[PDB]
Every structure is written in C-alpha cells, then in structure tokens.
Ligand binder design. Structure first.
Ligand SMILES: NC(=O)c1ccc[n+]([C@@H]2O[C@H](COP(=O)([O-])OP(=O)(O)OC[C@H]3O[C@@H](n4cnc5c(N)ncnc54)[C@H](O)[C@@H]3O)[C@@H](O)[C@H]2O)c1
Ligand SMILES: NC(=O)c1ccc[n+]([C@@H]2O[C@H](COP(=O)([O-])OP(=O)(O)OC[C@H]3O[C@@H](n4cnc5c(N)ncnc54)[C@H](O)[C@@H]3O)[C@@H](O)[C@H]2O)c1
Ligand SMILES: NC(=O)c1ccc[n+]([C@@H]2O[C@H](COP(=O)([O-])OP(=O)(O)OC[C@H]3O[C@@H](n4cnc5c(N)ncnc54)[C@H](O)[C@@H]3O)[C@@H](O)[C@H]2O)c1
Ligand SMILES: NC(=O)c1ccc[n+]([C@@H]2O[C@H](COP(=O)([O-])OP(=O)(O)OC[C@H]3O[C@@H](n4cnc5c(N)ncnc54)[C@H](O)[C@@H]3O)[C@@H](O)[C@H]2O)c1
Ligand SMILES: O=C(c1ccc(F)c(O)c1)c1cccc(-c2ccc(O)c(O)c2)n1
Ligand SMILES: O=C(c1ccc(F)c(O)c1)c1cccc(-c2ccc(O)c(O)c2)n1
Ligand SMILES: O=C(c1ccc(F)c(O)c1)c1cccc(-c2ccc(O)c(O)c2)n1
Ligand SMILES: O=C(c1ccc(F)c(O)c1)c1cccc(-c2ccc(O)c(O)c2)n1
Ligand SMILES: OC[C@H]1O[C@H](O)[C@H](O)[C@@H](O)[C@@H]1O
Ligand SMILES: OC[C@H]1O[C@H](O)[C@H](O)[C@@H](O)[C@@H]1O
Ligand SMILES: OC[C@H]1O[C@H](O)[C@H](O)[C@@H](O)[C@@H]1O
Ligand SMILES: OC[C@H]1O[C@H](O)[C@H](O)[C@@H](O)[C@@H]1O
Ligand code: NA
Ligand code: NA
Ligand code: NA
Ligand code: NA
Lengths: 255, 255, 255, 255
C-alpha cells in the first residue's frame, strides 16, 4: 500500500526494465498503464497483473502519446507518476560508422519521446503533486565505447531531468532519473548474441561490476517506487543502480 | 515488514536525523540499537518505541564502540545494518579562525568514529550479508562557506564510502552514503540561534532549495530504509536528499 | 610558440567566446580557420589577425562542413585541433512553451553540428595526433531554469565528449570539453536586453559567481590553448571555466 | 615568461610529481622554493635549476612550515602560489588491516599539512592576489581498492579546496586542485616493487588508462602552471590529469 490509490504510466513496459517497474508499482498498490510499441509482452502482462492495463503507443508519435494521456485520465481519473523507460541501445558502432541520420532517430526515441510524454502529462501531475522518473544510463555520466549516439542521448536525459526539476519545483512536481548499469534484459541478450563470442561478452558484463553480477529489472523497479512514493525531498537527482561499476580502476611506462 | 527480523545500529540516534532514522527502521519491522553520547533523547526514544533500545556510546571512544557492538550481538544475535549518523557542524568559522586542533577533533567525530564502528561491525555484517549507510553531506560535494574543517570531513566520508564498497563487494556487504542538504533538526536550530538574525538565517536556509522548504529527519530515514532493504544492486552510491539545492545558479561586468 | 606550426578550426569564431578562442590560438603561433555562418565579425577578424582566415560555414549544413574541412586541408596541409564552439541559447522559456520542433532545431546546432565537423575532421586529426575541444556549458551538469532544450543539448555534448574520447584514445586523438559559466558575450548582452530589467539581469549574472564578475572570452581561449597544447594526458575531461558558480548554496520550515 | 616575477612554494618538491611541478614553474620564469622533508633530491634540484632553492621542511611540523613561509618572504619579498603536493600512498591494505593510528598519521600528512601551509601563506597570497593548488587524486572521486585511509584523505582535500575557494573568493585568491591518476614516479615504482609480480602491477597500471600509458610529472606540472598563470576565472575546480581512467566500463547472470 506504499503507493495505493495512485496511477502510473510506464513507457516501454512490455519487457525488460519497464516490465520490472510495472510489477513493482502494481505490488505497491498502484494502477499501472503499460505503454509499449509492441503488443506481445505488454498484453500478456495486462492479463497477468490485476491493476495493470496495456495501451499500444509509440512514444515517437505525438498523437500516440496524446491518446495515451487522455485514455489514462478517461479510464482512471488522475495521473501521479510517469516513468519514461522506453529507449534503445544500437549495436556497438565505431564513430566513423555512425550517421547523423541514425543519431537523429535515436534522439527521437531516447530523448524526445521522454520530452513529449512529460510535457503532455505535466498539467495532470501538477494537479496530483505527482512526479516524473526518467530512465537514463550510467554511461551518460562516464561514457561507453562504440556508442557515441547512445551516450549523447543519455547525457541529455540526465541533464534535462535537472532542468525540468528546477522549472517544476514551484508547483510541487518532482523530476528525477535512475541511471542503471548492466541490467540483464532482452536487449542485453540480443546485443550479446550479435557479438562473435556472446558468452565472453556476458562474462565481461557481469564482471564490470564489483558485485560480480548484472542487475535485475526488479531492482530498478524498487528504486522507481522509492522515488515515487518515499523520496519527497528528492528532485533532480540521478539515482545510480549499477552494482558499483563506476567505482575504482579497471581495464580500459609513461611514454 | 520490509526489514523484519533485522538488527540495526544508528549512531547519534537520540535526536535529529538519527532519531528519524531510528523511527523509520522500527516502522520497517527492524530492531534498533540507538547509540548516543547523550542519554536524554535516546532514553526517551527507547521508552517510546517497542523494538528500540538505547546504549550510551561516544563513537570517538574505541572501547565504547567495542562494547556497543558486543552488546548488540549479545542481546539480539545478529547485526544487519550500521548507520553512521553521529556528527557535528561547528559554528561558522572563517578559515583564519580555524585551528589544526579543532580540525583534528572534528575528524575524530565525523570521520574516525564512522571508521571505527564500521571496522568493528564488519565481521558480523559479512555473516548477515548486511550493509553500511554513512550520513555525509551535500557540502562535501559542492563546498560551503565558513566551514573548511566540516566540508573536509564530509568529503572524506563520501570518498571512504566508495573505497570500502570496493573492498567489501566480494563479501556481499554493500556500503552507501546519504548526503542530506538543509534538514530541520536541533543542530540547525542551535546554529541559527547564534546568528545575529536567526529568522533571516532560517529563511535563507529554506530558500536555498528549489522546493522552498528544508527537509525532515523522516525523509532521510526513508532513504536509509531504502538503501538497507531494497537497494540490493547499489553499492558506493551517494544518495542526495537535498531538495535540489545543488541544481542551477543562485546568489553566491567581466572585469 | 606554444602551438606553432599547428592548424586550428574554430566554429562560431566571429564573435563572443569563439573570437576569444581564435585570438588565443593566433597568439600561440597557430594558423586559425574562423568558421561562422555570419560574415560580419569573422571577416573583420581575418583582416585584423595575420594567421587567421575566414570561411563562411553553417555547421548545420553537411556540405558546408565538408567544404570547411577540405578547404582547410587544401590551404594549410594539415589539421591539428577542432574547437566546436558554435551554439546558441534561446530566450528563457517555460517547459510548456517549448516545442519538439524548437528542440530538434537546437539539437541540430548545439549537438549535431559538433558531431558532424568532428566526424569529418577525425581522419586528419588521426594523422596529426590532434585533438577535439567541445564548448559545452556548466548548466549541462547542474541544470538551469527556463532552458530545458538548451540544458539537454549541453548534457549531450559533455557525454558525447567522453564517449568519443574512449573511441579515439587508441589512435592518439584526445577529446575534451570546456564548460563555461556566465561569460560576457554578445549573446549574454542580447538575452539580457529582452528581460524587463536588463540591468538587474546582468547584476544577478555577475553575482552568481563567487568571484563576483562574469568571465571573458580570453579566459575560455586560454583554457582551450591549454587543452590543445599542454594537456597531453587529459582526455574526456570537462574543464570548468565558471568563476565558482557551481560551489556552495545560493538563492534557488520543513513543511 | 608566463609567470615571470612570481614566487612559488612546492611541497614535496624533491622528486616525483613535485619535482615536475618545480621544473615547470622554473621554466615559466618563476622563482621556486622547493620544500621537502628529505634533502637528497631537493638539494640536487637547487644546484641544477637557477631560480629554485631548497628549504628543508616537514609539512607535518607546524614550526617547520612557519619557517618555510617566513624564509620565503625574507628571501624573495612576496608569495604568489602554494602547491600542496607532499603526500603519501601506503602499501595496499585490506580494511581490517588498517588502524585508526595509521589513519590519523596519513591525515596529518595528506590533509593537515596542506591545511597548515595554506593557512600560514594566505595573508601573503591575499596581498599578491595569488592562488593555491592542491594535489589530490582521482581516487578521492571514484575510490580505490585496499586504500580506505588514502582515499578518505584525498576526498577531504578535494572537498576542502572547494570550501576554501568560497571563503577566499572575496579577496581575489583562487583555490584549485589537480587530481592525477597513475603517474610514473618513485612512489609508483616503490609500491610496485612490493607486489608479488611487479611487472604485472605496472602493466595493469599502464592499461588502466584509455591512453595506454601512465602520466608524467611534467604533465602535472603543466596543469599547475596553467592553474597559476592563465586560469583567472577558475576557482574550486578539480582538474583531472588521468589519461581517461575514470571513463567507461572496465574489469572491477543477474543472480
Ligand atoms: N539493460 C541495461 O543494461 C540498461 C542499462 C542502462 C539503461 N538502460 C535503459 O533502460 C531502458 C530499458 O532498456 P531494456 O534493457 O529494458 O530494453 P528492452 O529492449 O529489453 O525493452 C525496451 C522496451 O521498450 C519498448 N519500446 C522501444 N521503443 C519504443 C517506442 N518507440 N515506444 C514505446 N515503447 C518502445 C520495447 O518494445 C521494449 O518492450 C532503456 O531506456 C535503456 O536505455 C538499460
Ligand atoms: N541538519 C542538517 O541540515 C544536516 C545536513 C547534512 C548532513 N547532516 C549530518 O547529519 C548528521 C546528524 O545531524 P543533525 O542535524 O541530526 O545533528 P544533531 O546535533 O541534531 O544530532 C546529532 C546527534 O548525534 C549525537 N552525537 C554527537 N556526537 C556524538 C558522539 N561522539 N557519539 C555519539 N553520538 C554523538 C548527538 O548527541 C545528537 O543526538 C550529522 O552527521 C550531520 O553532519 C546534517
Ligand atoms: N556566453 C555564455 O555565458 C556561455 C556560457 C556557457 C556556454 N556557452 C557556449 O559558448 C558558445 C559560444 O557562445 P557565445 O556566448 O559566444 O555566443 P555568441 O552568440 O556571442 O557567438 C556565437 C557565434 O557562433 C555563430 N554561429 C551560430 N550558429 C552558427 C552556425 N549554425 N554555424 C556557424 N556559426 C554559427 C554566431 O554567428 C556567432 O558568431 C556556445 O556554444 C554557447 O552555448 C556560452
Ligand atoms: N604517483 C601517482 O600516481 C599519484 C596519483 C595521484 C595523486 N598523487 C599524489 O601526488 C603527490 C606526489 O606523489 P608522488 O608519486 O610524486 O610521490 P613521491 O613519493 O614520489 O614524492 C613525494 C615527495 O614528497 C616528500 N614528502 C613526503 N612527506 C613529506 C612531508 N611530511 N613533508 C615534506 N615533504 C614530504 C617526499 O620526500 C618526496 O620527495 C602526493 O600527494 C600523491 O598522493 C600521486
Ligand atoms: O544495452 C546495453 C547497455 C549496457 C550498459 C548500459 F549502461 C546501458 O545504458 C546500455 C548493452 C548490452 C549489451 C552490450 C552492450 C555493449 C557492449 C559493448 C559495446 O561497445 C557497447 O557499445 C555496448 N551494451
Ligand atoms: O548544520 C548545518 C548544515 C547545513 C547544511 C549541510 F549540508 C550540512 O551538512 C550541515 C547548518 C545549520 C545551520 C546553519 C548552517 C550554516 C550557515 C552558514 C554558514 O556559513 C555555515 O558554515 C553553516 N549550517
Ligand atoms: O546564454 C546564456 C548562458 C548563461 C549561462 C550558461 F552557462 C550558458 O551555457 C548560457 C544566458 C545569457 C543571459 C541570460 C541567460 C538566462 C537567464 C535566465 C534564464 O532563465 C535562462 O534560461 C537563461 N542565459
Ligand atoms: O601511489 C599510487 C597511486 C595510484 C593512483 C592514484 F590515483 C593515486 O592517488 C596513488 C599507487 C602506485 C602503485 C600502486 C598502487 C596501488 C595498487 C593496488 C592497490 O590496491 C592500491 O591500493 C594501490 N597505487
Ligand atoms: O532475457 C533476459 C532477462 O530479461 C528480463 O530480466 C527477464 O525478467 C528475465 O527473465 C530474463 O532472463
Ligand atoms: O528542533 C528542530 C526539529 O528537530 C527535529 O526535526 C524534530 O523532529 C522536530 O520536531 C523539530 O522541529
Ligand atoms: O558584447 C559583450 C562583450 O562581448 C565580448 O566579450 C567582447 O569581446 C566584448 O568587447 C563585449 O563587451
Ligand atoms: O622513478 C620513476 C620515474 O620517476 C619520475 O617520473 C622521474 O622523473 C623519472 O625519471 C622516473 O622514471
Ligand atoms: Na490487468
Ligand atoms: Na523500546
Ligand atoms: Na588574416
Ligand atoms: Na638554484
């Protein structure tokens, strides 16, 4: 009952981190709207979880998002939290193999879809003194190899979170982000499968954390429920859920 | 029941932030040992809260801390979390008015008392796969005026948290810190009373946050319970509980 | 003679910070290509400074940038440093007054123009073991009010700098950014003139820094020459040129 | 002639990073006072470098430091820059192998010696509008394994730098720090020699940086000369001289 009576929208909620967040909010007593561009996972989740419903919505399509917000209000009467989780990591790409075109397309999803939903939701969040939770990434803060466009988009989300926190603070709306590290998800599995040695890639990924494992969607979900329900003096923070990957020296005489 | 069956030690738990943390852990189902160098507040808290007991202990005195740990194990059979909250902010002091002597004394409390309890507790935390929560400060990260020794001590705590997180990760013990901003406590009230205009000082303190108020001990307590009970992929993080004070430009042509 | 025999391209070099950077590199013995979308300032600078030449180039237009690079190589035979300074701050804008359209246009200048020039220059920088210097902003790191799109773009540049530093390190090309704070420039003057009280706006801007003044283009220029010519073990850093604005509490009881 | 007519004190200037800083300031036209607790290296440096003189001084001994300052003023008539470089890294030590005693001794050198010299020098730095440069470490920011006391001391120095920058800004005295990463020095050589495989230790140390080598004292020296002589709008900054060690994922599935 930590978040009972509340209404939450989770984008990209059909699988992976987003599905873990959906489950965490349902478990906290909230009603959850699962937004996803794919039907397969999110429709099954709706059947599985009382309190969760699925709405097909591509966050890059403004009219899709407008309908997502109006349908949430029509069906549930209020909106307390938006979790902007929908996003993508392309395969590893050397800088010279990237294009301005692919960069623009990745900005549309990872950055502008978060911007658009937040904008359309904020009038309702103001009425409820609700909050925004953006899913960024550790690599926005520390960088990553072969990922110039992805890193750029996540630096933008983390920065935007702080700007919007300033703008919305007079109105009682908090705006925070979570920066996960390596979380075992279908995306992590798909990218590893492209590598010449997928098992070596996964092993490297587990060992990049001092804790020696990857994180779970449920752990990101718990951090999101904390930020929504108990972090009433937190705004503009970047909550790291990384297993300590950013700490210390690793594998990355003076001549 | 988020932290039921667990045993928590909170230093400086008799008033202020520490008392808020005690209450939060009791409310989460834990048994709490209140450590304080003063009897007044902590003894009353023990009478008030089933599940909390008071042990007189000055964290600067090594034999006091040794007894704190052995008595916790003797009475409760396990130790899951140590919250190093005991600390002090001296009155505002210009750099030239500070002394190496006062600096050493403040390091003894704010830094070495945290080091000592952590050291003595870690064998038991390893057995329980428990965790350490240090209470640092925002000003360790961004600085503060008229507070060179205090700032120095909190930079040390935040850094130490990350070092110890690395060392203890192979053993399953997480080590994190909370960095509060302005929290309304008896210390905040005492320092404001020394200023020529205490009401102006408090007003400035509320307005240093975009949220426009100071934080509450209960909000720091919630962040501590999160870190203990639900943050299983977080180690070496600095969780900011500041109301957004670190964001944006404030009151701090090119000639 | 700190950077004698070297060839530097500075985008947005016709006025403001960019012109200060041009002058600093000329003073260091380099030959400088001034890129700007406007002729007025950059053409005068070319007449004033032996060693500087002006090339009309809008960094948002890919064929303009391709010509900038090929003309630099045709005229000077090498390329050692690219300074991506061209950028813009829109007038203050509440979140609900921004548009996805304006956001995309600002990303084209502040982020993708930097990406495009860097990409086209990197083959030549590899041959010279040269370097990239991006001009980001403090507010990418700490946020700013009424500036969600601008902040987002500068978070992206700072993050991108770190990603590209990783990718280019095996090839000996360093990639760094400078994050200025309030620098007195024609843009600062133009924005202040829109405010209801321009003099109050400028006064607030001087006092946002502990040093009590705004910075000068020449001070950003010196930091750029340092990064190019003497910082041979620095890559992926964010060099702050802010007068201390990010330090301490300012103007931004627990109920 | 970048720093001609100026007087600089460098602590721990007899070898390693400190000697590189001495040489850089001499090369910039300054007169340099080499402070060291050991005579061997610093006396030879005085014979080698016109413009440098050696004064025996243990920064942990307050009367030694008082004499250092008074002798600098007696001999040269002014004081423009203090570089607090003296410091030590103990051998790798597991947390349970450290002592409060060793921790206090390391704080005396790495933190309080910097505090003491700065305090005694500041009246003269105010007269000259001079500046303070503290040599901290990257690991104060990101942590390090088997080094809890060392990390703690460097977190303190970096934090203290920001506090003092705030306090001294009204008086025109800037206060900055440099955070080196792995720099090839006699200390690095001594510690590697203790390890079971010294060559593996050095190899790991070179490869912890994306640039693939360790840094040189001369590179830290250049950053110090920049901060003294050209960074007139920088105060309270942490200048990283690390070869990119803090960037990206390294060597540090969800169960
Ligand atoms: N997995 C990790 O290690 C990791 C680490 C850091 C950050 N993240 C971030 O977490 C988020 C989730 O990643 P994941 O690993 O769970 O990915 P995933 O690919 O497993 O799941 C993403 C979900 O979002 C949906 N989605 C994609 N594009 C969409 C669109 N236009 N509109 C609506 N829904 C859309 C997908 O259909 C999918 O259900 C992303 O923002 C990612 O950048 C992931
Ligand atoms: N109040 C704030 O705005 C603020 C902000 C950031 C960080 N903090 C930190 O939070 C912690 C608590 O501060 P507070 O405002 O609640 O202070 P407080 O003075 O109100 O309470 C501190 C408690 O610690 C106890 N204590 C002091 N020295 C001790 C010792 N040697 N051994 C055992 N107990 C001891 C005191 O008796 C008291 O009960 C401190 O570490 C402080 O630095 C406070
Ligand atoms: N002035 C500050 O306080 C401040 C603070 C932090 C960062 N910055 C950054 O510094 C940079 C310079 O800012 P400024 O204050 O000197 O601005 P300015 O407006 O005074 O000068 C910018 C220059 O860039 C040129 N330019 C603009 N769009 C261009 C394009 N498409 N192609 C080529 N040239 C183009 C302009 O014509 C102008 O000559 C920007 O990236 C800005 O974000 C400025
Ligand atoms: N070498 C690195 O990789 C590295 C990395 C980051 C930071 N640092 C820091 O750089 C500084 C210099 O380190 P280094 O590697 O050059 O060390 P070093 O041991 O090679 O040289 C240190 C010098 O300081 C002197 N010194 C020691 N104690 C002193 C005292 N009490 N009073 C006066 N002089 C004293 C020594 O005699 C020696 O000449 C230290 O603060 C260290 O923490 C070094
Ligand atoms: O999606 C991934 C990811 C990994 C970590 C993150 F912090 C993040 O935001 C995203 C992921 C999954 C599997 C492999 C990789 C990866 C591996 C090597 C690379 O060079 C790369 O750019 C990405 N990234
Ligand atoms: O204890 C205080 C405090 C305030 C903020 C913190 F982040 C913190 O760690 C401690 C506090 C309370 C009341 C006034 C002040 C204060 C005001 C002006 C000063 O110059 C100063 O050094 C401290 N600090
Ligand atoms: O260009 C400006 C600027 C100022 C500071 C920066 F760090 C930066 O990257 C850009 C600037 C100049 C004059 C006024 C303002 C400004 C004032 C109030 C605002 O709310 C705002 O968004 C911007 N910004
Ligand atoms: O002095 C060293 C050092 C290395 C890096 C730093 F950033 C720093 O401030 C100091 C150094 C030199 C050689 C080996 C080591 C080292 C290696 C393994 C360790 O576990 C450790 O604590 C230190 N540190
Ligand atoms: O596909 C990789 C992983 O994705 C998500 O974490 C799923 O919850 C988990 O069951 C699966 O193993
Ligand atoms: O003394 C200041 C404040 O300290 C703590 O926050 C107490 O819980 C609160 O009741 C009091 O107002
Ligand atoms: O227009 C504001 C300022 O812009 C730049 O800093 C110019 O160099 C300076 O002369 C002018 O005062
Ligand atoms: O002892 C290791 C190194 O220390 C310093 O860097 C010296 O300048 C260098 O000559 C030596 O190789
Ligand atoms: Na359902
Ligand atoms: Na009790
Ligand atoms: Na010319
Ligand atoms: Na000499």
């Amino acid at each position: 009952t930590r978040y009972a009576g509340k209404v939450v929208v989770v984008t990209g909620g059909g699988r992976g981190i987003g599905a873990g967040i959906v489950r965490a909010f349902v478990n906290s007593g909230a009603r959850v709207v699962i937004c996803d561009k794919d039907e397969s996972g999110g429709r099954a989740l709706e059947q599985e979880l009382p309190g969760a419903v699925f709405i097909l919505c591509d966050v890059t399509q403004e009219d899709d998002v407008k309908t997502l917000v109006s349908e949430t209000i029509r069906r549930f009467g209020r909106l307390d939290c938006v979790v902007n989780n929908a996003g993508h990591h392309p395969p590893p790409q050397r800088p010279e193999e990237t294009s301005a075109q692919g960069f623009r397309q990745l900005l549309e999803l990872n950055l502008l879809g978060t911007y658009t939903l937040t904008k359309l939701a904020l009038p309702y969040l103001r009425k409820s003194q609700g909050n925004v939770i953006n899913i960024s990434s550790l690599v926005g803060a520390i960088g990553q190899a072969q990922a110039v466009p992805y890193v750029a988009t996540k630096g933008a989300v983390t920065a935007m979170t702080k700007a919007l926190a300033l703008d919305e603070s007079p109105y009682g709306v908090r705006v925070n982000c979570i920066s996960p590290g390596n979380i075992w998800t279908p995306l992590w599995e798909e990218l590893a499968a492209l590598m010449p040695d997928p098992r070596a890639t996964i092993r490297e990924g587990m060992l990049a954390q001092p804790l020696g494992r990857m994180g779970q969607p449920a752990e990101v979900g718990a951090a999101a429920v904390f930020l929504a329900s108990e972090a009433n003096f937190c705004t503009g923070i970047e909550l790291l859920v990384t297993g300590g990957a950013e700490l210390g020296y690793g594998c990355k005489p003076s001549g």
